[model samples]
Structure formats: C-alpha cells, structure tokens
Target: STGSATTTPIDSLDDAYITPVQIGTPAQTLNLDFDTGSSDLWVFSSETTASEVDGQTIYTPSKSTTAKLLSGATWSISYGDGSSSSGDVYTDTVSVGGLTVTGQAVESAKKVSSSFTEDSTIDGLLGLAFSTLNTVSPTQQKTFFDNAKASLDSPVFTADLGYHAPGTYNFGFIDTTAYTGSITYTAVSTKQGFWEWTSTGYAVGSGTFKSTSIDGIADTGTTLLYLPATVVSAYWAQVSGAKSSSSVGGYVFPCSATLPSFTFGVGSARIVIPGDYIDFGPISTGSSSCFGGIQSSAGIGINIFGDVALKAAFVVFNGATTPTLGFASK
Candidate 1:
C-alpha cells in the first residue's frame, strides 16, 4: 500500500511546510520538516537541555519499547540558514503517513541552535535526500524512505507543495490525479548526495531565454529560489525600483512595483514562476519595500529550487533505478 501525508504551511505565506511523522513503538507523532537538502532524521528529544527545549515537543525514546540506542553513535548537523542540532542516535520504528520502517535511525537532539529553539513549531527534520548523506558516525543510517522502499509498489515519491494551502506528499506511488499535464523528466546527478540537476536556461519576464547552464538542487526546506548572481541581477533588472540591498543582503523592490515572471528551463519544459510569487513577502511591516524571492547562490556555489520555485510545479522524485526528477505544471 502507498503512504501519503498532508503538509501544512506554517506562519508566513510561503515560509515552510510541515508534516506529521510517527516515531518509536508507541507512535509519538511529531511535526517534521521534510528536507530534501540534507540527510539526517533528527528531532528535539528528552535528552535536550531544558533551556533548549522551550516550546518544542521532545521525542522520548525511552517511552518506546522498540527504541534501541546505538552505543557511541553520534550526529551533528548545521543548516545553511544557520540552524543546527546535534545528538546521539536511537534506532526505532519510524512511520510516515501509513508506512512503517523498522530499525530507522532517529537522531535524538541533545542540543539545538537558537534558530531551531526559537521556531518551536518545528519539532524535527526528516531528510528525504539519499542515504549517503546520513550523518551517523561509525556506520551510516538509512532514511525512513530508504528502508521502506523495498515494500513499496513503486520506488518513488511526489511533492505537491502549495501556496498558502495544504499539500500532500505521496510515497511509494505517484498519484496521477495530483498533477496535470505530462511530467518532464530529467536525470539527476546524486554525486553530492543531493537531487542535483542542470537547468537548460532561464528567462527574465517575457525576454528571450538564455541558454546558460545552471547546476542546482530541488530543496524543499529552503524558502527562496537561489540562482547565479548574474541571473538574479537580470531578473531584478526587469522590475522598476529594484535594487540590490546590501542591508537586506539580497535584492529588494518597491512593494507596488510591477515585477516580471521568471522562467527556468528543465530539459524541454519551461517552468515559469509568476511575478507575484517572486515578490516574496515584504521585508518590513507597513513598508513599501519587499524582498526578491530569487537571490544569488554565490557562496553556496549551487542554485536551489526552494519552496518558492517548487510550489509553482508538481515534482516527482523517482528513486526506481537511476534517480530522476520529473516536473509538471500544476
């Protein structure tokens, strides 16, 4: 049977989406961020310092009869956004949607950064990337999806992210009714333990599409689309009153500005992001300035098709043989 779960958008229009995951034998449910950018299933746990726990729910492994501690095994991870968590490892029965994976590695966080602590709603993160990226020491761990794949009718998952609405993540099988039109498939290079692929080109507004190759990843955890500096500059140039703001650390434009649509090429498919979506929410409250959702991937070195861009299309993360990414208009 296929497993699927609904993802709810958190505060803010297009910030982050979270889905419920059941872990351990007694089935303790936690809202987790299904991150494709990283590979570590970590959660705030009872082992966490009281001061670091705050309003987040803690996963008590001791409460689960099936929970097993991996003696001396530890993991620590930091995100590009500066949020971090580190803890010991626990093997438990982890379930997502209705599918269960026995002996899943569940990293119980003993310490968390201020960013994660402040965002109390996010109890943990479920890494959906390849298992090679798992952070466990001594021996690497498999993700819930990896362990459950053998039983699935199809080794695939689809991400149906929505804008200010609830979306569903389907595992083991693809729901054709969830998406429209034919899916444009592209081969992914998993060398970096990411869903890395090259974009054929891009276009700013209704301008001609430039055939500049861009290597990037489809990241569900990131909120904004990050592109090459030159590509970002070209898109912002189309908006009247748009300027690169050093203070804001990205491009910003007048709230009333008429922004143009940004389109990226995937194989032969042209995925276009609406102008309004590019205006990401305003930078300051009651201000006439708004931040551009498309920013530079300078330091990061690789572009990222984050929530802002992913929400514009239906994505299929196929794990059958050679992993491939399929994109289609919603």
Candidate 2:
C-alpha cells in the first residue's frame, strides 16, 4: 500500500516539523513531530504527569478499544544535563496518510522534560530512525515506517520539506513531480541508528569545491547545519562582519551582510543551499545581528545535515535490502 501526508512547519525559524497521525479504533488524531534523529514513537498522553501538561493534546488510551499497554515495557532518555523524559509503551492501530499499521508500539509519556512541556506545537514525537535506538526495555519496537514498509509497494519514504512552508511525506512511492532532475543516491550506514552518510565535498558560494570526505547524519529533527569548525569557518570568512561570538554561542553577522550560498557534494550532484537560508532570521526582534544556520560541530563531534540543509532539496530514505539515501534538487 502507498500513502502520502502533509507536514507543516511548526515555527517561523523552522525549529521542527509536525504531521497528523491517527491512533486507535475510533482514531484520535494527534499532530506529532516525525524525527529522523531518534527512534521512539512517544506522545503526550493522559498518562503523562498532569502537572507537566501544557497546551498539548494528550492521547487517552482508555477510550481507544484497540489500545493495549505493553506489560513491563518502559522507556526513558537522559541527556545527562538534567533534562529527560520517561514513559511506558502501548500497542495500537496507528495510521498516517491512509496507511494503517496494526499492533504498532506507541510510547505514552508519563513524564517529560521542561522543554517538551513548554513546546505546544506538537503533541509528541514519532521517530523515523532505526529501531535499534528505541528506548523500550525488553523489546525494542519498530518505527512506524519500519512496521509499514513490508505492506507498502516500496520500502522507501521520501521527505520533501520546505522553507517556512508545508511539505509532503510520501510513503511506498516517490512523487516524480515533487523534484526536478534525477536523484543521486549514496550508501547509508545504520551502525549507530542514524541515517548516516558521507559527503564528498563542499564549496562556498561560487568558490572551488574541496574534495574531502565529511561524515554526517541526515536528521530531519535538528534545526541547523553543523559541520567541522574548519568548514564552518571557511564559509563565514566570506561574509563581512561575520564572526563567531561567545556571547551568541555561534557565528553571527550584521543583518545587512551578504551571505554566500553553500554547496555540499552528494557524489557528483551539487546541493546548493541558498544564501537567504543561511541568514537564519535575526537573533532578536529589531536586532542588527542575525544567527547563522550553519554552525560548528567541534563540540558535537559529529556533523549534522539538519533541517537547514534538508529543506534545500528532496531527500529519500530507502530502507530496502541495501539501505541507501537519495537526494535531488527541487
């Protein structure tokens, strides 16, 4: 079976994205963030600590006849920075874009961190990453995409994200009209549960492309592009008044500064990120300086091709026998 769904940008800065997912027999629909960086289909629910509930819609499983709690299975994630979320698991009939999956593991949040409690844009998150990273104890559950792959016409899903706009998530089939030109696919390494891949090179605006490998993950959940300090520094050097500031926590430039487009190689294909996308909006209202969407990964240790990079083109997450990722210009 094939299916398609629409996803809307949750914030002006494009902090995250959300889509509607249907759960249970009566079909309680909840808007959830589909995260490729993590794997755990958790949601704000009646089970969540009441005091922690803010403006989010909670899923009440008691009313869903098909919802069944997974006995003794629990999950919790600690960031080691005093922020974390913990929950129990349930199996229910879940549907997205008319694609139904029975006995799908759904995580019901019993406790959530302050950040999750404060964010009202999404009810919770539905992970699109490999199940190996799933936090449920005793049994690591399959992701929605993973569970539905076998029943679909193709075991692939495509992400056509937009800049401050709505996009489509296509399952089982790629919408040929969504993008222009042929897709260039590359190997994906799931060793650490991420949609990891290596970039062949990078260039600043119309500058020469450096032929070197840069390993990173294609994460739909992240907000910005993070690369090695050397690469990031090179890009910033071309912009006047652009410098890394300790106070701002990253490179910021005068709002009027000219920004150069960034291009990263996917084999022979060149994915160009427009200069406007790199400008990222002003850090503060009426502020003269703005933050850069491209930041350094020195502290993170791993490069991340986040929403900033993802929105520039159409991406394909192929989960076939030989897992590979595809990229194409729109």
Candidate 3:
C-alpha cells in the first residue's frame, strides 16, 4: 500500500505504468527484474537493439532528469528457459509502493529477447526471494526488499503473490487480517539461499497427509506448481468428475465441481492450499479441462510450489544477517 492514507498517483519511472514500483526520476527509467531466485536489480539498454528487447520498459538516461550510468561495469543473467540478458550498470532512485530508495544500484542490459522482454505488466522484477541466486557480481548484489527492510514497520517483508488470476502483489507491512495470528519460522541450511524442504503429502478439505516422505521447494519464479507424477495422478483421481484435456505443451482439466482443499505437510506445519487456485485456465489440446496446478516435474529433480500456493502464507527471505526464510500466516 502507498504510504498516504488517500490514494496518491506517483509518477512512474517514465510515467507509462505502475506496479513493481518504478525507481528513478523523470531523467531516466530502468526496467528491473525483481526475482526471488536472484537478488539484484537489472535492465536492458545502450547496446541493446530495439528489436532484441521486448516486454521490458527501458530506462533511457536522456529521458530522466535524475539518473546516471555506472562506468566500466556490465551485468548478465540466464534463466531456465534458455533466455538471457546482458547490460551495463547504472545508478537511479528506486521506488516501491509509496517509498523511494535513492542512489540505488541497477543494471542496464544492452541485449534482451522475447523471454526476458515479453511481460509488460511489470517493467522489471523486484526479487524478494533468496540472495544466493543473485546474478550480479557479488560486490554489487542487492535485493529491493533488502534495501527496503528498514523502512518497513518490521524488518520483515512478506509476499502475497496472489492466485492464478488477477490479484494485488502486496509488499511491505504484513496484513494481520489475512492470518489467524500463528507463525512458524524455519532454520535454513547454509548450503544455499533457496527455501528447500521435504513435503510429506497433500490432502483436501478434512483429509490430511501424515507421512514424512514428501519434499519440495517454495518458488515464486515458477508459474505452475509441480509435484510427483504419481502424487498428481492420485490427487486428481480423488476429484469427482474431473476430466483431463490436452493443450499446448501441458495437460489441463475440466471439472465444474468444487475441488477439495489441499494441505501439505512441512515439518509440523500443515500448509493449506486453497481450492480456488486449482482452476487452471484452458491449456493443452483444446477441450476446456482444468489445468492441473500441481503436476509431475519430479524428473527435473525438484518439486516446486509456485505462486499459486505462496499466496496462502507469508514468506520472508532474510539476507540481512544470514540466509534464512521465516514463514508466517497473516
């Protein structure tokens, strides 16, 4: 939420769009990638050809009244989708919600492509996840939430990634109204910054999973929640009247009935995944089958709980002292 009690329309990085709080003044506006897997701010510019960069709102120094390019420094990032961007470093005033972080470090990419360029909804991502994956040079790495930690009511930052459809991507102060006042913090191993854990199993409504055999990771970068194929098939089998339809590259489902509530076992916490999220839009072949939000990706060696499952809980990535994630409700 913006700091003001009343709604105040702040100027965008270029006054084009708002969301993921644009940084800098009218002099320049650089697109930022706020990723959870990585902790760094980057954009594409200068050497980047207009055709190569798409979906990203470029930060042009000439257009901003207050911005400067960092000399002799460059940055690059590669994603699982085989997409990458390379650019120069720059300095600018970054903003989020209603606050401004001045003289913040940002990367300006000289080269970008469709995968990195397609999404216009957010000029750049403000990764609030782990810091270990930061793609920037170690000396210059910084996450937006890390920079904003002091400004928040608490030193904590929570991400409400919302469901499959439209919803607010809230940051900063935690909304007590959303939770039942219960929170559990987990100690992260020092191996890496990713929030890795074992999942016992999943259940719907009154159903529950008691075994300790499940394991997975909570990731915001991934869009679809993936599980073991056997587990996925088992869960779908329980859904009454659920039919599978093929579309595009993945399979979707068609079910008019209400889906059962899903619960995951992580240690002692019984993490619940709401049923509304089970409704994945028509994908796969053609018929309208509800896409399986949780499918098999075990072959990839990691089970990922995507944004659809994250909105139900509050996640905190602590890079301030050491790498640790604090999970809470509310």
Winner on lDDT (1 vs 3): 1
- Candidate 1: global Cα-lDDT? 0.90
lDDT of each: 0.90, 0.91, 0.58
- Deviation from truth (RMSD, Å), model 3: 5.4
Q: What TM-score, to 2 decimals, does candidate 1 have?
A: 0.97
Which residue ranges in model 2 land beyond 4 Å of their true spot? Answer: 78-83
Name the better of 2 and 3 by TM-score: 2
Q: TM-scores across all candidates?
A: 0.97, 0.97, 0.78
Q: For this target, which candidate reaches the highest lDDT against the unseen true structure?
A: 2
Candidate 1 lDDT for residue 153: 88
lDDT of 1 by residue, 1-330 (tens): 579999988776768889999998788999999999999999999999889877887899999999999999999888988888899999999888898888999999999999888888899999999999998998999887788889988999889998878898999888888777889999899999999989899998889999978999999999999999999988888888999988988899998988898999989888988887787668888888998899999978789999988988889999877999999888
Tens-place lDDT per residue, model 2, 90-131, is: 999999999999999999999999988888888988888898
* Predicted candidate 3 versus true structure: per-residue lDDT over 216-316, tens digit per residue: 66666665567777767666777775544443444455646576667776556767877766666544345455566666775567777666566566666
- Cα error of candidate 3 at position 230, Å: 3.7
Q: What is the lDDT of candidate 3?
A: 0.58
Better by TM-score, candidate 3 or 1: 1
